[PDB]
Amino acid sequence: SGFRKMAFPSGKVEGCMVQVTCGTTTLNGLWLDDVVYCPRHVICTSEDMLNPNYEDLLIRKSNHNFLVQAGNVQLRVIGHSMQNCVLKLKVDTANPKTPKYKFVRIQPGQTFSVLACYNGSPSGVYQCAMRPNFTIKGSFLNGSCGSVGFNIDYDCVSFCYMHHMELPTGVHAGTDLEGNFYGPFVDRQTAQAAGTDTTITVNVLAWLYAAVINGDRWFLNRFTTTLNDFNLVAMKYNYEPLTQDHVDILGPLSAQTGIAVLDMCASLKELLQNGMNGRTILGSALLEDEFTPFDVVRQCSGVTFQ
Amino acid sequence: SGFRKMAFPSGKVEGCMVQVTCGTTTLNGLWLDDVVYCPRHVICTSEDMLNPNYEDLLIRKSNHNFLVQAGNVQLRVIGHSMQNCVLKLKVDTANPKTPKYKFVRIQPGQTFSVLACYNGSPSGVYQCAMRPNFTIKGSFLNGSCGSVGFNIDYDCVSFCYMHHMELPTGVHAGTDLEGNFYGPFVDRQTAQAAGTDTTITVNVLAWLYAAVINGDRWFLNRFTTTLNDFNLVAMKYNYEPLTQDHVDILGPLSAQTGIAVLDMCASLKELLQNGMNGRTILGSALLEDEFTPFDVVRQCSGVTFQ
């Protein structure tokens, strides 16, 4: 029993973290096979970041200008190229601890683990979710750029995020492993606005199901509702609209508890209108939306991974 | 910026997890050097657990009755002994991935990372705290016994917890790596009561400091207070009493924010008496007490570890 924000084991990713240095800027890189991936703004100085012309800045850089370091041993750069917002540094030695990996672009509402790194060394692990406004609520300090977000599926590592920048309200933005940003953000030191942050309704319902599995059932009322009626209430509270696909996804949880999805929606409707009156759910006084239905099944069944 | 429940990187511990089988009971073991540690109730059947006589049950077991398995390869048991509530199985092969480790008995209010395992395979990582009633609010299913709690200090792993049992109200109990339980619990399938759970005041203050570092300052009022006056209010709300040692420990955080500890206590006093009125602190509608002052410094300075 119990429920916690659980992260994936970081062992397979710790061996791929290296340190990339260009001039005085030092950040983290992802060493897979004989290629190292890192944010392209490592070639920028403190002044270039205000209005960087990455093409022109790359003209004045050569292979020997990149210092890649894995522990006390450094890698020799024999080729560099820019793919969108990431730099691909070709090194002479292939990573012997390379796991079976993929590159995936993950959708909003999905979750992943973040291995926060500094100077190529893993510092900590935590779980995040891609917000609907294409930002994440992570924990990053200076020098954390190049840290990667990942998922583990059996024995494969699915890389989906690389940290690039911090927004002036404290949230974080980045790219996939192909250099494409999540959202309309650019790697420029300029004022950039993030859109409205809405609540992932399907994730709230999955979390409410986890509470029912773990004892908390005070929020369960008598009423039921319809998709159209619940969604009309959800739009006033900036909640994502529920679809029949979301209902099928919640299938495992509804069958485990014996509570239909529409019945749980009516319970969520009362919580949105009347609040919680001081009662907690799974040790939380707010509605948690950073557990996917898949994460709840994992914690309430016990999938292992190698 | 940002703040999240961050766990330590689990790479060094994943290589020490094995699977221990005795009869039909299968659980996790900690493989360090040529010794495997696991909860002693692996020798119990479903019936023995009601009133186990561990000495008598161990008389009928021999070395070849223990199946230790590390992946697809199994270890041969050449010696077994019982130290308090853990079994020490001596194996023929030493773990080649053995990290530099310690065994520590950790104090209440301190935190650690848990690598939840099933059948010897790491499933997930999360951060816990030793509650003052010597229980933890973890996330464990059947077969999770033998999972270990640990801390990383530079390059050393400090093992401090091994999961043994679940309490009838959903909290979890276990031992240190020397077999001694935390709290007055025994490894018996019988009704066992946990004491009153109080709030770790020094951890709440550290969390309030992290909020001030990250923008949230609405709770900061005009008043100050004294240790005796704050502690009189803390005893009504089941809070741990603050000492001068706690004030010295919060030294780094008070100097970073310019807010004296006694000033922060007066702000916590108003929150205990008047509530939060619907406002959130660091994305939480309750007072968080599972961040030690050391964990906050780590997240707000960026210590790395190898």
Resolution value (Å, 1 decimal): 2.2
Residues 147-206 of B with CB under 8 A from A: 166, 170-172
Q: Which helix (H) or strand (E) holds B73?
A: strand B73-75
Among B49, B106, B51, B85, which residue's Cα sits nearest to residue B185? B85
Give the chain B residue whose CA is nearest to the CA of A277: B278
Query: How far apart are the C-alpha atoms of B165 and A124, rounded to whole Å?
Result: 27
Maximum alpha-carbon separation in chain A:
70
**Which residues of B are less than 8 Å from A128 in CB distance?**
4
Cα separations in angstroms, B73 against B18, B39, B121, B229: 10, 21, 13, 61
Question: Which of A8, A128, A137 is nearest residue B124 as measured by Cβ atoms?
Answer: A8
Say which residues have a Cβ less than 8 Å from residue B180's Cβ, sequence separation at least 6. Answer: B84, B85, B105
Query: How far apart are the C-alpha atoms of B147 and B114, rounded to whole Å?
Result: 7
Query: How far apart are the C-alpha atoms of A116 and A123, rounded to whole Å?
Result: 6
CB contact under 8 A, B125 and A10: yes
For tokens 């100085």, what's the residue? Answer: A45
Dump the DSSP string for A181-234. BSSS--SSSS--------B-HHHHHHHHHHHHHTT--TT--S----HHHHHHHH
- Starting at the earlier edge strand, list the strands of the sheet with B25-32: B73-75, B67-70, B17-22, B25-32, B35-39, B86-91, B77-83
Catalytic-labelled residue, pool A16, A22, A38, A41: A41
Query: How far apart are the C-alpha atoms of B304 and B306, rounded to whole Å?
Result: 7
Mutate to test the interface with B, among A3, A5, A144 (most CBs of B within 10 A): A5
Query: How far apart are the C-alpha atoms of A240 and B181, rounded to whole Å?
Result: 46
**Structure-token pair, residue A293:** 């239905």
Question: Which of B9, B171, B283 is nearest residue A125 as measured by Cβ atoms?
Answer: B9
Query: How far apart are the C-alpha atoms of B51 and B190, rounded to whole Å?
Result: 8
Known catalytic membership, residue A80: no
Query: How far apart are the C-alpha atoms of B79 and B96, rounded to whole Å?
Result: 19
DSSP reduced 3-state for B148: strand
Contact A224, A201 (CB under 8 A): no
Distance of CA A123 to the CA centre of its chain: 17
φ/ψ of A274, rounded to 5, equals: -105, -5
For tokens 């509270």, what's the residue? Answer: A237
Give the chain A residue whose CA is nearest to the CA of B296: A139
Chain A contact present for B212, CB below 8 A: no
Name the amino acid, one letter, at A127.
Q
What are the start-end ranges of the E strands in B92-182? 101-103, 111-118, 121-129, 148-153, 156-166, 172-175
Chain A contact present for B61, CB below 8 A: no
**Which residues of B are less than 8 Å from A280 in CB distance?**
286
Maximum alpha-carbon separation in chain B:
70
**A149 to chain B, closest Cα gap in Å:** 14
Query: How far apart are the C-alpha atoms of A199 and A139, rounded to whole Å?
Result: 20
Residue A47 belongs to a domain with what CATH number?
2.40.10.10
Query: How far apart are the C-alpha atoms of A204 and A181, rounded to whole Å?
Result: 26
Known catalytic membership, residue A16: no
Query: How far apart are the C-alpha atoms of A187 and A86, rounded to whole Å?
Result: 10
Residue B274 belongs to a domain with what CATH number?
1.10.1840.10
**Which residues of B are less than 8 Å from A14 in CB distance?**
9, 11
**Which residues of B are less than 8 Å from A5 in CB distance?**
4-5, 126
Query: How far apart are the C-alpha atoms of A147 and A17, rounded to whole Å?
Result: 8
Q: Are strands A101-103 and A156-166 parallel, antiparallel or unpaired?
A: parallel
Q: Produce one character per residue of B260-276: b if its CB has 16 or more CB atoms within 10 Å, e if not.
A: ebbbbbbbbbbbbeeee
Question: Which of A143, A166, A170 is nearest residue B215 as measured by Cβ atoms?
Answer: A170
Among A112, B86, B147, which residue's Cα sits nearest to residue B139? B147
Full residue range of the structural domain in which residue A35 is found: 11-91
